[PDB]
Design an enzyme around this catalytic site. Structure first.
Site, PDB file in Angstrom:
ATOM      1  N   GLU A 272     -35.954  31.623 -35.316  1.00 44.87           N
ATOM      2  CA  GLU A 272     -34.647  31.526 -34.677  1.00 44.87           C
ATOM      3  C   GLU A 272     -34.183  30.073 -34.554  1.00 44.87           C
ATOM      4  O   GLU A 272     -33.003  29.787 -34.720  1.00 44.87           O
ATOM      5  CB  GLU A 272     -34.665  32.170 -33.291  1.00 44.87           C
ATOM      6  CG  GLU A 272     -34.795  33.685 -33.308  1.00 44.87           C
ATOM      7  CD  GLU A 272     -33.521  34.411 -33.726  1.00 44.87           C
ATOM      8  OE1 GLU A 272     -32.446  33.770 -33.853  1.00 44.87           O
ATOM      9  OE2 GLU A 272     -33.608  35.636 -33.946  1.00 44.87           O
TER      10      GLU A 272
ATOM     11  N   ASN B  54     -27.550  34.787 -26.911  1.00 43.76           N
ATOM     12  CA  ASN B  54     -26.134  34.855 -27.263  1.00 43.76           C
ATOM     13  C   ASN B  54     -25.183  34.859 -26.059  1.00 43.76           C
ATOM     14  O   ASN B  54     -25.444  35.514 -25.052  1.00 43.76           O
ATOM     15  CB  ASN B  54     -25.896  36.098 -28.126  1.00 43.76           C
ATOM     16  CG  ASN B  54     -24.454  36.240 -28.544  1.00 43.76           C
ATOM     17  OD1 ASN B  54     -23.724  37.075 -28.017  1.00 43.76           O
ATOM     18  ND2 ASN B  54     -24.031  35.419 -29.486  1.00 43.76           N
TER      19      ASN B  54
ATOM     20  N   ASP C 123     -17.774  36.086 -34.255  1.00 40.75           N
ATOM     21  CA  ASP C 123     -16.973  36.660 -33.173  1.00 40.75           C
ATOM     22  C   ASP C 123     -16.625  35.615 -32.109  1.00 40.75           C
ATOM     23  O   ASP C 123     -16.024  35.939 -31.087  1.00 40.75           O
ATOM     24  CB  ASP C 123     -17.684  37.871 -32.543  1.00 40.75           C
ATOM     25  CG  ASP C 123     -18.904  37.500 -31.716  1.00 40.75           C
ATOM     26  OD1 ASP C 123     -19.362  36.343 -31.754  1.00 40.75           O
ATOM     27  OD2 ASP C 123     -19.423  38.391 -31.020  1.00 40.75           O
TER      28      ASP C 123
ATOM     29  N   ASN D 174     -21.305  32.152 -33.902  1.00 38.46           N
ATOM     30  CA  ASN D 174     -21.144  33.408 -34.642  1.00 38.46           C
ATOM     31  C   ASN D 174     -19.682  33.675 -34.955  1.00 38.46           C
ATOM     32  O   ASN D 174     -18.798  33.094 -34.346  1.00 38.46           O
ATOM     33  CB  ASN D 174     -21.709  34.593 -33.858  1.00 38.46           C
ATOM     34  CG  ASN D 174     -23.133  34.368 -33.394  1.00 38.46           C
ATOM     35  OD1 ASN D 174     -23.411  34.371 -32.192  1.00 38.46           O
ATOM     36  ND2 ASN D 174     -24.040  34.195 -34.336  1.00 38.46           N
TER      37      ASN D 174
ATOM     38  N   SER E 211     -18.747  33.843 -30.305  1.00 36.69           N
ATOM     39  CA  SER E 211     -19.860  33.577 -29.413  1.00 36.69           C
ATOM     40  C   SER E 211     -20.829  32.577 -30.053  1.00 36.69           C
ATOM     41  O   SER E 211     -20.760  32.299 -31.244  1.00 36.69           O
ATOM     42  CB  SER E 211     -20.580  34.877 -29.058  1.00 36.69           C
ATOM     43  OG  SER E 211     -21.186  35.424 -30.216  1.00 36.69           O
TER      44      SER E 211
ATOM     45  N   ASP F  65     -25.061  31.135 -30.094  1.00 27.16           N
ATOM     46  CA  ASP F  65     -26.474  31.338 -29.738  1.00 27.16           C
ATOM     47  C   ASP F  65     -27.139  30.038 -29.297  1.00 27.16           C
ATOM     48  O   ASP F  65     -26.923  29.002 -29.909  1.00 27.16           O
ATOM     49  CB  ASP F  65     -27.237  31.911 -30.927  1.00 27.16           C
ATOM     50  CG  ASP F  65     -26.657  33.217 -31.405  1.00 27.16           C
ATOM     51  OD1 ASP F  65     -26.142  33.971 -30.563  1.00 27.16           O
ATOM     52  OD2 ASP F  65     -26.747  33.502 -32.612  1.00 27.16           O
TER      53      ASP F  65
END
Ligand code: CL
Ligand code: CL
Ligand code: CL
Ligand code: CL
Ligand code: CL
Ligand code: NA
Length: 129
Positions: free
Chosen positions: A35, A59, A48, A46, A50, A52
């Site tokens: 990750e 998230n 959308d 991301n 958002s 991380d």
């Protein structure tokens, strides 16, 4: 902070992740490697809108507040910046809540695609724990 493999394993163990909800320590180390490459300061946006955050790439749509993800929740009740600290306590505590929400570690796409079904024990081999 960029962790060493055994250093992160030892830190996760002390914070109660070894066998948490049935997931052995190796699973957690494997997920953190893929990750974030063991970097607490990792961030990724991301599509959308958002973002991380941190060692386990938690998230902002559901778990933390970064003040720029509209109509999002803050289920770990923390600013997302707290997940970037060299102290992994907030990340670990929030991950415990995520892995308990029903889908287990499948919440982490890299775990599902790169750790699940592999010899995850290999990630803590050689470590003094
Ligand atoms: Cl393991
Ligand atoms: Cl927000
Ligand atoms: Cl912005
Ligand atoms: Cl720590
Ligand atoms: Cl599970
Ligand atoms: Na949020």
């Amino acid at each position: 902070k960029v962790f060493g493999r055994c250093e992160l394993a030892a830190a996760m163990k002390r914070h109660g992740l070894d066998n948490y909800r049935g997931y052995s320590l190796g699973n957690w180390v494997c997920a953190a490697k893929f990750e974030s490459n063991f970097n607490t300061q990792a961030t990724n946006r991301n599509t959308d809108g958002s973002t991380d955050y941190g060692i386990l790439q938690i998230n902002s749509r559901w778990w933390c507040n970064d003040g720029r993800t509209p109509g999002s929740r803050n289920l770990c009740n923390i600013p997302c910046s707290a997940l970037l600290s060299s102290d992994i306590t907030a990340s670990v505590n929030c991950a415990k809540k995520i892995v308990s929400d029903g889908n287990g570690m499948n919440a982490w796409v890299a775990w599902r695609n790169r750790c699940k079904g592999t010899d995850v024990q290999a990630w803590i081999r050689g470590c003094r724990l």
